[PDB]
Amino acid sequence: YRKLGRTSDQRKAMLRDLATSLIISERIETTEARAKEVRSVVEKLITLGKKGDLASRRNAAKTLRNVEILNEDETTQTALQKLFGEIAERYTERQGGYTRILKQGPRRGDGAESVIIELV
Amino acid sequence: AVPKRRTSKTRKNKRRTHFKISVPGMTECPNCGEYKLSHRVCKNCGSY
RNA sequence: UUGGCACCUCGAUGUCGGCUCAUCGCAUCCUGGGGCUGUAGUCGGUCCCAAGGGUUGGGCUGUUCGCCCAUUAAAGCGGUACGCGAGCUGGGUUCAGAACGUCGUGAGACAGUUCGGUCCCUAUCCGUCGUGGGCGUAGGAAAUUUGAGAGGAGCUGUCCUUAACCGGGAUGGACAUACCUCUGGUGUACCAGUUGUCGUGCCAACGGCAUAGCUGGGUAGCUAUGUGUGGACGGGAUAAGUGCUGAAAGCAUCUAAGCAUGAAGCCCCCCUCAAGAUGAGAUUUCCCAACUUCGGUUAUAAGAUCCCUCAAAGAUGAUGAGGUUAAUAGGUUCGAGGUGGAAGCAUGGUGACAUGUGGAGCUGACGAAUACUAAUCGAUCGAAGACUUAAU
RNA sequence: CCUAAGGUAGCGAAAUUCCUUGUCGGGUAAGUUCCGACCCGCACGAAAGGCGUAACGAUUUGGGCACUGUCUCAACGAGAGACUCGGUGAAAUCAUAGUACCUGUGAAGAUGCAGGUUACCCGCGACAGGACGGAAAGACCCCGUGGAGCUUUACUGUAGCC
RNA sequence: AGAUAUAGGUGCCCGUACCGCAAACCGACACAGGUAGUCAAGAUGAGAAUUCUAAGGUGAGCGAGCGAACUCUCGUUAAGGAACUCGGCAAAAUGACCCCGUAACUUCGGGAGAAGGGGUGCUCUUUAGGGUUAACGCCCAGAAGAGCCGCAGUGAAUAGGCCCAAGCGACUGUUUAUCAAAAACACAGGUCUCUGCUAAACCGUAAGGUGAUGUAUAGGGGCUGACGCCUGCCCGGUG
RNA sequence: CAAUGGUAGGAGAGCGUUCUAAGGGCGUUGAAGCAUGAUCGUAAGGACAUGUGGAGCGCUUAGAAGUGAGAAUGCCGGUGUGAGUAGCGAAAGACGGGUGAGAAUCCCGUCCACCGAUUGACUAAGGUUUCCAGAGGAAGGCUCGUCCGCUCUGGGUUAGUCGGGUCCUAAGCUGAGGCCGACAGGCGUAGGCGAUGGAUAACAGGUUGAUAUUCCUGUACCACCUAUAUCGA
RNA sequence: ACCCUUGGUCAGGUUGAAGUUCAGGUAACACUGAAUGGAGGACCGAACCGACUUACGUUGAAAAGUGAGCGGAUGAACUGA
RNA sequence: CCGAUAGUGAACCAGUACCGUGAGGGAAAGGUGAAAAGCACCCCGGAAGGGGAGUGAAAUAGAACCUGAAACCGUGUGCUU
RNA sequence: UUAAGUUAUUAAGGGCGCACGGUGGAUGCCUUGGCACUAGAAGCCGAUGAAGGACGUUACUAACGACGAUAUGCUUUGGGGA
Ligand SMILES: [Zn+2]
């Protein structure tokens, strides 16, 4: 497990934000150290969604954050509803995977190595 | 704790023998005849 | 050691004791070997050879010394700026305050005590501990190696037997080294109990913050106080010694020629490093054409590298496991070990709570399967073997 | 015999006692410190007070209980710097430097001198034995017919006062 | 002494921005320091303490990695438990409210929170009252019983370690801004002395002042230092 | 033929630098200065050729001096070394969208964090335009910057009642005449100055990018003035 | 540093002086009980003011600081103009 | 007599920046060309900067603008390691 | 083809010479500014409000000079002539 330059309390809160951002935007640019680490956090959550029951929706709420998604024509949705409803039906025959990292150059103000994370 | 003699120009240019940088990987792109880093995306009609 | 001299240093060469880390001498404290004894045995006394290793914890005092207590085979003595303050400490000693005895008309002082009291520096060069790159080793590579030379290790209690020596056994102390199966420590992305308070609209379930809020356990890894191993048996040449044959010297004599014997020491034996050992060694494998203006040159080969996924390796780099003709990491699936009975539901109870469903549910590093995601496409380097002589 | 008079009480090896770690008792396995006693007070002593004293003290000294990584003897974990990469970027110091070692030599303790020994060329992370390493024209010690504050029955004056 | 109740209007100058526990002020800096006063909610509490939040404000003017030594700041540790050290330095341990208990010595006030022990969570029964109100209500407190859970109930945070004996100074207080906080200085009390008022004493050339709008139970100076029991001899020398 | 090592010192002969006199010369067909060269004299030193440079400058004899530098922990300038080294000043951010030549760092959003007897709201002092709106990115900002307390050019502070003066006095400071003193001046009476104190008539709501008990709306109060016995030390 | 004039600040809790009243007791006092009362360079502890210990800092964030503990806190207190 | 480190501290918006509570202390900083004839227009760039074209005897005479030494910092190379 | 021997290629970097550049402000030439004097002439200003200052005035106005609400000047007498 990487430590990412934070303290274990800040490192935990920073991945609960990274994970809820993949669930909402489907695609984010991070650094390549936070991408390798947060793929494990969002993939262990996809299996809670596609597992289905109530006790696994109780364990997804220990990680996701309370954010509302604005759908088309004002039909709001919670980030935990979008994960157990819609991200759990397209990934119902894939056995591992779910996510894709793509490298880019070094960014400008420090040469940190930019990366994109998708859902596959 | 402090230098006893100054450093000559000869001894200064030898220490700097290894203070240099190398070029990047930088292969050519198949989609556009171009240059990109190996294993990264192309910064010109970004393909991979 | 106390001094004699005043040659080095006043535009600064930092005291005493202790701590850390040592290193050398031998005029030997123990252990090894011997001669003499006023040596019966057990213990000794003395002198010779011997520096391989070893050579303790406390009380009192700033102490060094010294005196004690309890041990040990032993509690050696000295040099190294009375070793070591750009390694540490600052208790004594000679900074400013204050006081006692004493001396002085006094300011003050010590022929003496007492309580308090500021130790700076980012390593340039040589040195020395690690770890890389370049060139060389007459073609370019990949492995395996010899060992010139170097560095380690070397300690010795008690008991049983022989029954005091010489002989045989069994077990310890202190030091080294490798390792995590065992007993333990830690274990901040592991499980559980619990308090205050603010939240997810409420109940129930949960999240933030309070040293990781606090408390009870704990996987891998790293670890000692834990678990194993080691200094074994021996050879060569000698020391002080003990001799044999033997004359110089018609006898004697270990010595001059000869010949033996003889130590924890010397050179090996054991353990690591070692062809930059420029004297650059050796084995068995791999690759081996086109073009010239005949001078030589290109790219390519075998081999590597860049870049990327990594850990058993790691400051970096290097070393190792792999890159689709793929199990290298992640995810997924099943496990080992850890926690110790989830949620929901139903029953019992007035209630806090209990029981069942059910060794439940969760679970970071550990063992196996599986190409679902990423190790894509590419690029750089890298040989055609000089002339002398002698044999074929 | 001397003097103006010769130290009373109370305390005493002491914030005072040099000899001295005095002696004896107590406390510890072992007590130069500590407490109780002794009087031989180098050199206590009565308003520069003597002797005693409840309470109070970031006061000094000695001993107990508890408690501990202070220690035997160290091990693991978290974070900041160190370390690699991108940005920005000093200072002290400095005669010129291609800046080994040993035994000598020498202004009598050598990177640089002699005779030997050892060492391919250039980095990076570390440690502090030397460069009599840096910093401050030694504060110790002596010397200037140097300075300054203070003292008095040194000298010479003087404000004041009678 | 003295002297002779509505209706319309008029009202000047200076300050006024912004920072103001702060990057606008004093510290050479957009500097971990200093800077009077007013206001100040909820849960918990004796509280303006503690921990978490409101109104409101802020995210710190270099970052990304990796998770060596060594330095720093923090947490844990088998068995032992001051053997460490000049010295328990540092760390650990104590810590709240309630109840029971508490020694010598004393200046009778103290010593004293002496010491040394026990309790503390939640549920349900029944039980005595005390603020305000016609009652219900609404607040504030107690006692006894029967149970339930955990390793642990001030379940977190904040809140004295105790005792024995000796020296010094009675005590609260003051001091070497920047190496000394003390046994040194103050002190309440004690004593000696000088001073009869335009006082002595002190400042100043003087005039004017302090002393003092005081008057010997007052004022200045020297020594001593609470309180208790006391303070011996010497007037030759110096004043 | 003979002499010629030399510190402290003594003695002699000279070289070069600025300015003056007299004489005679050279210079836009290129003086001085600067740079380079394999030249000359016993030395200090003197020429010549080229390049650059753009207006002055040598020679001879004599005269006069601010007349020659490697050292003073010298003075001033400006450039190294140490060195791509130390540091970058207490504390949490993440992602999305947007703007731009350029974004970890600017603006908007969501979530998360931190203070809350204060990192909140006022207000003295002090500072003096830092305030507001448009625009900018040289330097300043310990990085970046499209941003700013920085630069540019336009703005912003409204009072009979708030605080101060046209009211009072304290400590202190001044003081006609006066008293004292070499000078200068010191002191002091009446009388004045002097808040940190006493006195003193306005409230609520709305409004700007920037001011409000000041502007606007509503409702007030105080002093004076004119129309329609009392005053009093 | 001392002083002069005129202002301001000190959360919360604990102790329980002298005086009084009662009741008892005495020829009368004196006395000893109980309430009441609210003294003090008193006690504990924030704000505030100080500076005993240690670590860190020592080309400091700072030409006297910071972290953790420590002392006073109704007075001979602290602090403004 | 000096000729920009000289000569007044000051040749220049000098008793000025700046420093200090104050008295007071006290700098650095001259030169386009005869004439502004001070580079219209094109090209790269957001701009700065530059390459051409033109003005001029001359533009390294382009506004820090006469000459332009040394220390110092570079790029290319003949011989060398 | 084997043995024995001898010598050369390299340059990561460095050294010396030479060319060409940058920084910098010495040197030369130059002068507005000062330094030392000589001859002549002055040797006081102020309540009729001084020396020295503050604030202002221009068509646009930071700043120096000039000068004052008659303000970047007003009148008169005399030079001078685009
Ligand atoms: Zn492309």
Side-chain angles (χ1 to χ4, degrees):
Chain A
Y1 278 154
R2 280 165 178 90
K3 289 197 304 206
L4 298 171
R6 320 259 180 201
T7 303
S8 58
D9 62 6
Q10 311 170 356
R11 169 163 68 261
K12 176 192 172 156
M14 193 187 170
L15 298 158
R16 296 175 69 190
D17 205 81
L18 263 303
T20 317
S21 302
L22 260 175
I23 302 319
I24 296 177
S25 298
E26 306 280 319
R27 180 166 179 155
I28 65 181
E29 320 164 352
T30 328
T31 44
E32 72 154 334
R34 300 156 192 180
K36 283 189 195 301
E37 289 316 279
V38 77
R39 70 199 161 147
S40 300
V41 192
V42 59
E43 296 207 28
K44 58 173 89 163
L45 272 186
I46 299 277
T47 74
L48 287 176
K50 77 190 289 193
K51 185 200 153 181
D53 60 336
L54 174 87
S56 47
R57 181 191 302 247
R58 296 277 184 86
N59 301 157
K62 295 176 183 189
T63 293
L64 290 174
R65 287 276 166 68
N66 278 109
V67 302
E68 295 146 40
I69 319 304
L70 261 295
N71 282 130
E72 270 60 47
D73 208 17
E74 181 67 31
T75 83
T76 199
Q77 190 175 58
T78 297
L80 180 84
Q81 282 159 6
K82 180 202 182 79
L83 157 79
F84 265 70
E86 175 194 4
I87 321 304
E89 296 292 326
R90 66 165 70 122
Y91 292 139
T92 182
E93 288 87 7
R94 201 173 293 241
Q95 191 195 329
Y98 312 153
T99 203
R100 187 171 191 263
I101 281 164
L102 294 138
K103 293 174 81 158
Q104 300 179 330
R107 68 191 185 179
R108 177 195 176 274
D110 49 21
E113 212 256 322
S114 285
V115 164
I116 288 170
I117 326 170
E118 310 171 346
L119 286 171
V120 292
Chain B
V2 88
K4 190 58 141 53
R5 304 273 325 125
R6 62 187 209 171
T7 312
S8 183
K9 298 189 223 175
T10 311
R11 168 172 326 261
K12 178 179 70 183
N13 287 141
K14 291 171 154 177
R15 192 192 54 234
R16 296 188 180 162
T17 306
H18 293 290
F19 309 159
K20 68 170 79 172
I21 57 189
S22 67
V23 295
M26 207 191 65
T27 43
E28 301 224 334
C29 179
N31 208 61
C32 296
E34 274 299 338
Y35 273 101
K36 65 186 273 290
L37 296 187
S38 299
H39 287 87
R40 284 89 201 281
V41 191
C42 190
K43 296 313 313 299
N44 185 301
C45 290
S47 174
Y48 185 90

